[PDB]
Design an enzyme around this catalytic site. Structure first.
Site, PDB file in Angstrom:
ATOM      1  N   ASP A 380       0.813  -1.234   0.000  1.00  0.00           N
ATOM      2  CA  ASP A 380       0.000   0.000   0.000  1.00  0.00           C
ATOM      3  C   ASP A 380       0.847   1.286   0.000  1.00  0.00           C
ATOM      4  O   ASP A 380       0.474   2.263  -0.658  1.00  0.00           O
ATOM      5  CB  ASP A 380      -1.027  -0.003   1.153  1.00  0.00           C
ATOM      6  CG  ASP A 380      -2.135  -1.052   1.055  1.00  0.00           C
ATOM      7  OD1 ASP A 380      -2.473  -1.465  -0.081  1.00  0.00           O
ATOM      8  OD2 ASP A 380      -2.707  -1.406   2.105  1.00  0.00           O
ATOM      9  N   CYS A 414      -1.434   2.498 -12.885  1.00  0.00           N
ATOM     10  CA  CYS A 414      -1.577   2.367 -11.439  1.00  0.00           C
ATOM     11  C   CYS A 414      -2.734   3.355 -11.120  1.00  0.00           C
ATOM     12  O   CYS A 414      -3.724   3.301 -11.850  1.00  0.00           O
ATOM     13  CB  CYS A 414      -0.282   2.660 -10.669  1.00  0.00           C
ATOM     14  SG  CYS A 414       0.506   4.251 -11.050  1.00  0.00           S
ATOM     15  N   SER A 415      -2.642   4.219 -10.078  1.00  0.00           N
ATOM     16  CA  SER A 415      -3.673   5.210  -9.707  1.00  0.00           C
ATOM     17  C   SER A 415      -3.489   6.502 -10.552  1.00  0.00           C
ATOM     18  O   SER A 415      -4.270   6.729 -11.465  1.00  0.00           O
ATOM     19  CB  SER A 415      -3.586   5.525  -8.217  1.00  0.00           C
ATOM     20  OG  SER A 415      -2.276   5.966  -7.880  1.00  0.00           O
ATOM     21  N   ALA A 416      -2.429   7.305 -10.300  1.00  0.00           N
ATOM     22  CA  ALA A 416      -2.118   8.522 -11.085  1.00  0.00           C
ATOM     23  C   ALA A 416      -1.375   8.182 -12.423  1.00  0.00           C
ATOM     24  O   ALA A 416      -1.368   8.969 -13.379  1.00  0.00           O
ATOM     25  CB  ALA A 416      -1.311   9.485 -10.245  1.00  0.00           C
ATOM     26  N   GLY A 417      -0.760   7.012 -12.467  1.00  0.00           N
ATOM     27  CA  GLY A 417      -0.080   6.562 -13.666  1.00  0.00           C
ATOM     28  C   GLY A 417       1.298   7.149 -13.846  1.00  0.00           C
ATOM     29  O   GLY A 417       1.783   7.265 -14.982  1.00  0.00           O
ATOM     30  N   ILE A 418       1.969   7.471 -12.715  1.00  0.00           N
ATOM     31  CA  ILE A 418       3.309   8.035 -12.794  1.00  0.00           C
ATOM     32  C   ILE A 418       4.346   7.278 -11.887  1.00  0.00           C
ATOM     33  O   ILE A 418       5.451   7.035 -12.354  1.00  0.00           O
ATOM     34  CB  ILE A 418       3.295   9.585 -12.566  1.00  0.00           C
ATOM     35  CG1 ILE A 418       2.737   9.977 -11.158  1.00  0.00           C
ATOM     36  CG2 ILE A 418       2.510  10.313 -13.679  1.00  0.00           C
ATOM     37  CD1 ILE A 418       2.663  11.418 -10.890  1.00  0.00           C
ATOM     38  N   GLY A 419       4.000   6.934 -10.646  1.00  0.00           N
ATOM     39  CA  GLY A 419       4.911   6.284  -9.693  1.00  0.00           C
ATOM     40  C   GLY A 419       5.234   4.820  -9.928  1.00  0.00           C
ATOM     41  O   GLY A 419       6.350   4.500 -10.360  1.00  0.00           O
ATOM     42  N   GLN A 461       8.364   8.051  -8.801  1.00  0.00           N
ATOM     43  CA  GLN A 461       8.110   9.063  -7.790  1.00  0.00           C
ATOM     44  C   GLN A 461       9.137   9.162  -6.660  1.00  0.00           C
ATOM     45  O   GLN A 461       9.551  10.267  -6.327  1.00  0.00           O
ATOM     46  CB  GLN A 461       6.702   8.871  -7.194  1.00  0.00           C
ATOM     47  CG  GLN A 461       5.577   9.350  -8.112  1.00  0.00           C
ATOM     48  CD  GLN A 461       5.493  10.859  -8.147  1.00  0.00           C
ATOM     49  OE1 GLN A 461       5.190  11.498  -7.129  1.00  0.00           O
ATOM     50  NE2 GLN A 461       5.856  11.464  -9.283  1.00  0.00           N
TER      51      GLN A 461
END
Length: 480
Positions: A380, A414-419, A461
């Protein structure tokens, strides 16, 4: 990006802002992946926490951003409450500059410039203690050393202008090169590369960085202000609600442009094409929202994508990170003009595979299989303790991708698509090099990252993901 002070304590930040700043004066500093934005208001200092767990920079009492530079650009140009960001308080520390080598000898510098450098390759090293040396390569080839005097907190090359920092001296002699007595122009074209290692050397480099990783990560971060490219399309009113995070936007120059839309503003998706530049390409995207599910399938259809990599669970800490955009096993669903069948789901230890059949409604011969690799075991917060799981997953994904003739880019979200998205794509690019060339090839972790970050902002990130990439690549080499 001079407003970021890498080695300053909270009290040092306060005193600096109170003695050298005014109201609206600000700086950012690291704390664990935590940061602080320190601002002067009414002759007092307010410290604003910015957290990054791996997905985005989460400014407390503010919004979410892809990079600290995009965070500073947003508040300077605009929102910030208990606070105006007016004047960057400039850092004079050269630690995170690619050209700074600190304690380095003359012969060591010359040897480095001979083995690694080209015409215009330069470095700054410690000298006369307290003083510095500019070692530059030109071209027969030659190395020229220029003495940098430190006098009462200012830097100079023997005469002329005295500089407040080594950075101002370097930026001035970059644009206005020194000319030698016999006509040689001491052009500062590019800093010496120190991070490109040979893949067989991975283990040695990783021993060195584990003593390191933070310093090498912060020097990469110090290059993000070169990546403040336009993100206008995501900013349009009709595209605002198509973004999971209002400020985490795709770059205009690499965005996926959706065609054949319903005949107003039908061409937008928060996604970027990632083309490795130095064989497969990627689409780095966010997790769908209820109102972008149809757009997502339109993209996969148009781009001819045959493989999707999902690196988040749908729900994490009671919050939706990605809506279920795929039907239930054996079910058939329509998402606008797109029809999707979940043919079969195969559960592995770290992931689930979903075999989907995508086609356009009204044209049965448009059917193609989309393989969805849903990585389910990523923690998480933080990163996995062992990269083995991520590595076996990427090997399965690679082989599936390779087995399909004319397959379009690999979709990663993923969620934001960067990390996590950036972490998996960079691991995939580096392992692709090692797979076709073996241990005998040069790999440059921060350069690959900077190349990917120029195509979608904020790719990779945290320092924890940075280190994980190195651990994953070292592990892949170790198990050949």
């Amino acid at each position: 990006r001079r407003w970021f002070h890498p080695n300053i304590t909270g009290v040092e930040a306060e005193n600096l802002l109170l003695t050298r700043g005014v109201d609206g004066s600000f700086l950012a500093r690291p704390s664990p992946g935590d940061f602080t934005l320190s601002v002067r208001r009414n002759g007092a200092v307010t410290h604003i926490k910015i957290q990054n767990t791996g997905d985005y920079y989460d400014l407390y009492g503010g919004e979410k951003f892809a990079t600290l530079a995009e965070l500073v650009q947003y508040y300077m140009e605009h929102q910030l409450k208990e606070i105006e960001l007016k004047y960057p308080l400039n850092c004079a520390d050269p630690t995170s500059e690619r050209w700074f080598h600190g304690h380095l000898s003359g012969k060591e510098a010359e040897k480095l410039l001979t083995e690694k450098g080209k015409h215009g390759s330069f470095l700054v090293r410690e000298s006369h203690p307290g003083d510095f040396v500019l070692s530059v390569r030109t071209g027969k080839s030659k190395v020229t050393h220029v003495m940098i005097r430190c006098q009462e907190l200012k830097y100079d090359v023997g005469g002329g202008e005295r500089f407040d920092s080594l950075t101002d001296l370097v930026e001035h002699y970059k644009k206005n090169p020194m000319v030698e007595t016999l006509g040689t122009v001491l052009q500062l074209k590019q800093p010496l590369n120190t991070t490109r290692i040979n893949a067989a050397e991975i283990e040695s480099r990783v021993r060195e960085l584990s003593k390191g990783f933070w310093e090498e990560f912060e020097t990469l971060q110090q290059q993000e202000c070169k990546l403040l490219y336009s993100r206008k399309e995501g900013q349009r009113q009709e595209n605002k609600n198509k973004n999971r995070y209002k400020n985490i936007l795709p770059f205009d120059h690499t965005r996926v442009v959706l065609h054949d839309g319903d005949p107003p503003v039908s061409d937008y998706i928060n996604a970027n094409i990632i083309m490795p530049e130095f064989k497969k390409s990627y689409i780095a995207t966010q997790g769908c929202l209820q109102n972008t599910v149809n757009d997502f399938w339109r993209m996969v259809f148009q781009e001819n994508s045959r493989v999707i990599v999902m690196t988040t669970k749908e729900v994490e800490r009671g919050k939706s990170k990605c809506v279920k955009y795929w039907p239930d096993e054996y079910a058939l669903k329509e998402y606008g003009v797109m029809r999707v069948r979940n043919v079969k789901e195969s559960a592995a230890h770290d992931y689930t595979l979903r075999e989907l059949k995508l086609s356009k409604v009204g044209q049965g011969n448009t059917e193609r299989t989309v393989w969805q690799y849903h990585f389910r075991t990523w923690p998480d917060h933080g990163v996995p303790s062992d990269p083995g799981g991520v590595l076996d997953f990427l090997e399965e994904v690679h082989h599936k991708q390779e087995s399909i003739m004319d397959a379009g880019p690999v979709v990663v979200h993923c969620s934001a698509g960067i990390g996590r998205t950036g972490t998996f794509i960079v691991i995939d690019i580096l392992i692709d090099i090692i797979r076709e060339k073996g241990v005998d090839c040069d790999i440059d972790v921060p350069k690959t990252i900077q190349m990917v970050r120029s195509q979608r902002p904020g790719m990779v990130q945290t320092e924890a993901q940075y280190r994980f990439i190195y651990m994953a690549v070292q592990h892949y080499i170790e198990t050949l």
